[PDB]
């Protein structure tokens, strides 16, 4: 289930973080606008780019924690808060999160792994709601 998926991702975090985020950026290339130096690079170039490594690990280690601290896929208010008032997220609206979660769930469903894909969809849904209740668009 959801709890195990967190352990699965943590076990191989670097690889899952890069592959999922690459799935995200390839599905929605215009989302690169928030990162900038991402454009003009293939998957392999991004995987070796220092900042992409840093960005993806920071996104996914915290994502796993927000997931882990949640109850029945409902995030803590404090976790929604950090995500909203992060200076790095000043350009974001809830739709950016929705798109990340479309890609992530699509990745899990296509994978040769027993992910609880439906829970990650539900978690994405609840996180958008919590982000909006803390202030997004
Ligand atoms: C729930 C999923 C997400 C989590 C847990 C998360 C968390 C984080 C964390 C921990 C950082 C590092 C902040 C620091 O340097 O201290 C970060 C940076 C950043 N995040 Fe997110 N984030 C998420 C979703 C997103 C999405 C969907 C986008 C846009 C598509 C985004 C855009 C950014 C950007 C642009 C940065 C700054 C990278 C830089 O230094 O240039 N985040 N995020």
């Amino acid at each position: 289930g959801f709890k195990q998926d967190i352990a699965t991702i943590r076990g191989d975090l670097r690889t899952y973080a890069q592959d999922i985020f690459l799935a995200f950026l390839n599905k929605y290339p215009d989302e690169r606008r928030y990162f900038k130096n991402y454009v003009g690079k293939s998957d392999q170039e991004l995987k070796s780019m220092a900042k992409f490594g840093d960005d993806t690990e920071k996104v996914f280690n915290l994502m796993m924690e927000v997931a882990d601290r949640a109850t029945d896929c409902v995030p803590l208010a404090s976790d929604a808060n950090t995500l909203v008032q992060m200076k790095q997220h000043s350009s974001l609206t809830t739709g950016n999160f929705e798109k990340l979660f479309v890609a992530l769930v699509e990745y899990m469903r296509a994978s040769g792994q027993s992910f609880d894909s439906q829970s990650w969809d539900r978690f994405g849904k609840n996180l958008v709601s919590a982000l909006s209740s803390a202030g997004m668009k």
Side-chain angles (χ1 to χ4, degrees), residues 66-82:
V66 180
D68 210 3
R69 293 189 274 263
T71 297
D72 294 319
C73 310
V74 180
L76 301 175
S78 307
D79 280 326
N81 287 336
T82 170

Side-chain angles (χ1 to χ4, degrees), residues 102-117:
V102 171
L104 179 147
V105 175
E106 181 185 66
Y107 170 91
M108 289 182 170
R109 287 194 292 243
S111 80
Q113 176 77 235
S114 50
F115 285 112
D116 200 343
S117 76

